[PDB]
Symmetry: C5
Subunit: 311 residues, 5 copies
Amino acid sequence: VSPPPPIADEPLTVNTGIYLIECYSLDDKAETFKVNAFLSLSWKDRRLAFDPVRSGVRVKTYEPEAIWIPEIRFVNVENARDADVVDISVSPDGTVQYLERFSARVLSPLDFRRYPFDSQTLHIYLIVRSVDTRNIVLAVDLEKVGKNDDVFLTGWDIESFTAVVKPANFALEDRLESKLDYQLRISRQYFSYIPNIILPMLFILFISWTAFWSTSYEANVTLVVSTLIAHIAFNILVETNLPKTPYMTYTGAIIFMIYLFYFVAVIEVTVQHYLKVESQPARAASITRASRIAFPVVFLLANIILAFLFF
Amino acid sequence: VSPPPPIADEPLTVNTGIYLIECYSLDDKAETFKVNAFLSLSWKDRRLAFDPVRSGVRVKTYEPEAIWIPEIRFVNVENARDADVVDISVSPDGTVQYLERFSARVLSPLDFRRYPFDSQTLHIYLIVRSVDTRNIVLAVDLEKVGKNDDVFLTGWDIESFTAVVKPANFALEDRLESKLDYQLRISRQYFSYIPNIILPMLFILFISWTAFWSTSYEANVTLVVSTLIAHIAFNILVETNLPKTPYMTYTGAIIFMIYLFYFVAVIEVTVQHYLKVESQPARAASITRASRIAFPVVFLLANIILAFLFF
Amino acid sequence: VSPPPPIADEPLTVNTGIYLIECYSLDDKAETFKVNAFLSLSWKDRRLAFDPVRSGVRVKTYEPEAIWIPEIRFVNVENARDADVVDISVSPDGTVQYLERFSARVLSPLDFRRYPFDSQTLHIYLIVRSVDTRNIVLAVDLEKVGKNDDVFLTGWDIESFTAVVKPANFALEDRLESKLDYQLRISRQYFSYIPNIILPMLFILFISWTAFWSTSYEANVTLVVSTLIAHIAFNILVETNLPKTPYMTYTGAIIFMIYLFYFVAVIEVTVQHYLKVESQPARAASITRASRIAFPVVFLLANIILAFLFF
Amino acid sequence: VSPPPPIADEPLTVNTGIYLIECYSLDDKAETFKVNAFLSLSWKDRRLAFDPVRSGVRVKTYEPEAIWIPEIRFVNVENARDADVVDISVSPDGTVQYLERFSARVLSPLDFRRYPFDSQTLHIYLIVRSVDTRNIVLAVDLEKVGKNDDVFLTGWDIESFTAVVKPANFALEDRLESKLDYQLRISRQYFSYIPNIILPMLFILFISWTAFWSTSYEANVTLVVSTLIAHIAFNILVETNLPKTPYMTYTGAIIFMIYLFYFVAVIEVTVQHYLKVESQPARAASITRASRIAFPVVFLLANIILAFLFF
Amino acid sequence: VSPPPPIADEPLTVNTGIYLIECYSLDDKAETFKVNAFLSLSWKDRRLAFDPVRSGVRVKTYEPEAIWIPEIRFVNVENARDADVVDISVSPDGTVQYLERFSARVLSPLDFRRYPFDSQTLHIYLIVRSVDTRNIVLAVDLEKVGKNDDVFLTGWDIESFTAVVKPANFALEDRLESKLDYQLRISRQYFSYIPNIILPMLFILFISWTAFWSTSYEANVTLVVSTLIAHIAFNILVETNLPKTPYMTYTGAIIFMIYLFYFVAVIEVTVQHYLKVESQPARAASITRASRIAFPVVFLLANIILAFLFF
Ligand SMILES: CCCCCCCCCCCCO[C@@H]1O[C@@H](CO)[C@H](O[C@@H]2O[C@@H](CO)[C@@H](O)[C@@H](O)[C@H]2O)[C@@H](O)[C@H]1O
Ligand SMILES: CCCCCCCCCCCCO[C@@H]1O[C@@H](CO)[C@H](O[C@@H]2O[C@@H](CO)[C@@H](O)[C@@H](O)[C@H]2O)[C@@H](O)[C@H]1O
Ligand SMILES: CCCCCCCCCCCCO[C@@H]1O[C@@H](CO)[C@H](O[C@@H]2O[C@@H](CO)[C@@H](O)[C@@H](O)[C@H]2O)[C@@H](O)[C@H]1O
Ligand SMILES: CCCCCCCCCCCCO[C@@H]1O[C@@H](CO)[C@H](O[C@@H]2O[C@@H](CO)[C@@H](O)[C@@H](O)[C@H]2O)[C@@H](O)[C@H]1O
Ligand SMILES: CCCCCCCCCCCCO[C@@H]1O[C@@H](CO)[C@H](O[C@@H]2O[C@@H](CO)[C@@H](O)[C@@H](O)[C@H]2O)[C@@H](O)[C@H]1O
Ligand SMILES: CCCCCCCCCCCCO[C@@H]1O[C@@H](CO)[C@H](O[C@@H]2O[C@@H](CO)[C@@H](O)[C@@H](O)[C@H]2O)[C@@H](O)[C@H]1O
């Protein structure tokens, strides 16, 4: 057992395919997902030719250790995948059809910029390293790339599973390495974020603005500080579900901005009271009357500007 | 070792059964459960027959590696199942009886629409892929489907464990695949949700409505905002136990609706105060007097409407 | 290797012992615990007998695979136990003494009715399934059931480790199965629940009742609603440590009842205020005067009733 | 392969050492720690002795399965340790030197009485069970007990790693068992508890006592109940990092005591107000004036008593 | 199979390289990180030398078990690494080129002093232990130390991966041990700490200082105590992400200092009110007027001092 030798001096082509049976645990924080799939491998090995006549059988079945099998590995996994050889078929010419079922935890960065209205392309990268007597090179048999209909990934919509057909070939520590990019295209179901986070967060903000219709300092201070706190809670909640990014995310921004609104609300509440104590309620009155319009208007304007920047 | 060949040209029939020994860890968020069970397999292998009278043994026992065993796999598992072969028996006509004990973690989607008053059908899907010299096909021996009496799944009632007797047969990458649907029917015990979540949540809401019997703005603001905060707490608690769905859930909806009630209460409290400061207590008085009835009534109507839409 | 055949036509008796070396991770929520222990098996295999004299040896040693060993399994485990065969001895008349050291995660339901003053019986169930040429049956050699003195199980007191001597024998898929019940009797150390949960929870309740000595609506509302929120916190704390049961638990009931106290307190606070605004302080005064005694008395009466019902 | 037989009728002596390479994950709640270490074993096997002059070689090598090796096991682990045999040397007189590198998770109870100013003695117990043809007995080769200089265990100082030289020998199920006690002496770095928990907790308490310089019931009620809540938070935080003990811990006590202070502060705030409403401000005034001194003094005295009881 | 013997009496040099394919899970609390990489080993074994001419190949392939391979291990890992041998090549003069792909969890202490503006040096320590017939010694082939371009470690910037070329050699239990230090230089992306923790924390503090423009005790008590509570929440949040250190961290220090601010704020609020009740508003007035400037100024001075001490 060692690689099949060249008729001319060509590289050995290994045809690959991945067929997804299960998708689970897309973990936003860790940036990983779990996959369970068929991996198929095919390649010519002429040493394996045989006569159906002189051997009885149209196809031969072999056990893994009886024949050379190319060492395909995944790049972006945590551990070597878990693999069960399902079947090895050789047709008389010596074409080998290899089928395994595997499960793995795959590393794959997400772009959180438009969370929770984002989409992602997950990758599974197949690789192979050339041996000394010859160069091995990968290809996609499109016939054998797919996914079953039930493959659901909680909280995500699956758009498509396809491979980039042309391998990236490169040198790595003095041997040739041939790498393939399988892509799984998903988009986040943002639905639930609406009732669970966004609206509650808006409600509490609007409740704060009722301070603009009140001349009670002690009341206002309570309205504004209390809701501020609830906002902090949502902030903390939302940030425990995301990893820490070196860029602002869309929700992140809305969340941050809204602090500014609480801060300016407190100022207004403070100024209004101060003026009142100093015996000038009319200036106060018209600062408050303004705020009733200004706050919602600037809040709306600022949001449109953000949606534009982000989307 | 390779498949037993056809007398005529029929498929090979593998009879299967699953007998549950343990059920644990129905995890709502992950949408998985753990199972520990007997898997039974039976099929005819004529190469293995013998004389009942001549042999003087009724039956005969082999070690897994000595005979052909069909590769049965689970579709919706995380990893290949953990299996000990318990026993393999071959009788005179060459019928093999195979028995393993296995544990696995099974993926199976839940419908959270009626949570926490919901029911589910868990699935375990057995599958086999045909080989080159013949097609393998699955069937259910009902005699060998079941579950022991103590199988308790915490926080759920077990209704039934049955198999859909007719396999789904289909082609997958150019070979026939035979698949069976075992169903575990369960329903959630909603009991504890009542004292732990629902009632507390109502109590704090009703406490909010005491503001309708109070002319103190500062008091009301404290009543209404305080309880709203406790409501957010229950909301966050509830939503950490569920996964994120693209559809409202029953509890989800009640929770969301109740925000609307707090918001409107705050408005009323604001309006009442405003009119009082503006020297018109009698309009204020009759808005509050209306609210004493309107709030409980519309809360009751809205709930009946919801239970009707959901159930 | 296959089962030793009957002298007459008797079943094969396997004597068993379990000797606990470690107990850890009694997890209330999952209802499981971890064990590490010796498992000892003994049975007669006549094919293995020998003359003491032409051998010059009292005993003989074997490696697992060299002789027939009965397949004992645990019923109520997650996965097949982890086992090291420590030693196998065969004495002249062919009595085999088998000793293994194993660890396993055991499933075992708890009765949370009297938490945290509760006791439990943990079970480890040994089983064996009969083969075709004979019936195997389990027994307990009391000599070899025990636990070492240091076996401590955090937060629990260990009462006793004993086996029910008589197996339950029954049929399961057309073979006889012999099952033994080892029982580990424990009771919860309730001590810490007192200063960590119970008393705090009482202190905040009592603090609430100070509203009965205050004519300040604003003050009272603060007292009552504040402490109610702390109560919710302890409620949430407590319920994250327990699984969800279809029955009320003792702590659960105290917790729930207390909500009723807060609710009625808020009513009283409300009524008192209302009457005062409506210029009748004397009715108010005697409702409050009553409450100072009613609340603590009815609280004490309701608790005695509950302890009675639960204990 | 079976045990080397006695020259006279002596027991076989296995010399042992443990050399720590890594210490991590001292988990207070689980009462476990993880260790990575060399385990060294030495014993005389005469069947293996050879000549140095004629052999030309002065030491001989072996693979594990080629010679008898005593089965040493750890008592207080979760699972059998993970072990790579590093090397096995045999010298001319047939002395074997065995070396393995292992990792394990070790169970070892902690005394939380003085937390977080506490010290602990972790234990790793080695054990061996005698075989039928002779008794095996353990000893410590001090030359081979130690730890590397970088062995750091987060949040703990390492004082010393020594073995108690004399084994405990005892019978267990009719065989002799020899057991050795390796001790790892550590003490907790309490530093960070000071700024993270203790001081904040004192700060909020002191803030509570400002009520004693205030004649505002509403203000006071807010001061006291608010801080009491923050106190509960620190309580809950602290108790999630400890396991539940059947004894008071030092911090636990301070934490519990402090509730008593809040409760009495609330009473005082209540009494003061009551007297004021009832038109007697001078009794009120001198109760408060007393409390300004009493509170801090009794708090200081109570703490000295506790430190004394605990330390 | 055993070590290749010296031409003269030289040590055997093993050349090593590590080439990172993946970095993930830098966990601050556990002080560990996960790595996935090529490890390459090279050394001369003359027994394996061969004539290019007579044998008709310029390279020679072996399976691990067929030749001697030095036992290289990592020092600071949790468990033995997970390794596939990728390839073993022997050239004519008997130079062996070994290549494995491995994954491991590496322990490596972090200096938290400047968190979250900190940088770290992660280490992977390769080691080998000499055998009896000769001394093995490690070196770095710089040709073979590297990392691929996509190696991203979430929330960290990767500066460089280099090896200190000169081994530390030392004796351990009477054998020579040769150890190499591969260093991975990273610095934390502090960006998101700004909007998520730092600014919110400053906002709530500034809100507190509005109390300095308010003569309402009851209001002030609410501002200062509310925000103090929010600060405790940020404190708790921050400290659950960090392990417990025996030194103050930068954030740690800001956070602690800020408590001092709240406490002094409360005192001011208290004194102001006291003086007012005692009929001297003018002292009060000028204490508050001072505080409006003192607080922000001393806050700013104290921060410059801190940055200076820490950076
Ligand atoms: C004034 C102060 C107010 C402070 C309020 C702060 C509220 C704190 C809420 C945090 C709740 C923590 O739990 C929140 O929900 C569940 C469900 O996804 C998750 O719990 C579990 O842990 C992680 C795993 O790393 C998650 O990825 C998640 O899938 C789940 O398995 C958390 O990641 C967190 O998102
Ligand atoms: C003002 C805002 C305040 C709002 C704060 C909301 C408080 C949120 C508290 C979260 C509760 C902690 O944990 C919540 O409860 C239980 C459910 O029975 C689960 O807690 C369990 O703890 C352990 C096991 O004991 C983990 O294995 C965890 O994954 C989960 O099974 C979580 O999945 C989560 O849903
Ligand atoms: C309106 C006010 C709302 C306030 C509500 C506040 C509720 C706060 C929730 C309490 C948080 C405790 O949640 C948890 O309790 C138990 C049981 O799971 C935990 O005990 C352990 O926690 C972690 C590890 O330490 C998990 O592995 C868990 O399975 C358990 O072993 C505590 O460590 C704590 O993390
Ligand atoms: C109105 C009242 C509000 C009260 C609110 C109380 C807030 C309580 C917040 C607690 C947050 C969780 O607290 C922290 O969480 C994690 C951090 O990974 C820990 O979980 C883990 O527990 C064990 C092992 O499982 C330890 O090894 C620990 O270091 C940690 O890794 C907890 O034991 C605790 O350290
Ligand atoms: C994985 C574990 C997750 C951890 C979850 C733990 C989160 C705990 C959240 C803390 C609850 C906040 O508790 C908060 O205390 C103070 C601050 O207002 C309040 O107590 C309050 O006294 C005053 C002064 O504040 C007012 O605001 C008034 O509203 C009253 O309720 C409450 O309004 C409440 O909002
Ligand atoms: C007035 C009192 C207010 C007190 C409020 C205190 C609230 C504290 C809330 C903190 C909740 C825990 O904080 C965050 O939540 C969890 C939930 O998956 C996240 O999940 C995990 O926890 C930590 C620590 O175990 C890491 O292992 C991290 O990599 C992540 O996997 C972390 O980001 C955690 O830091």
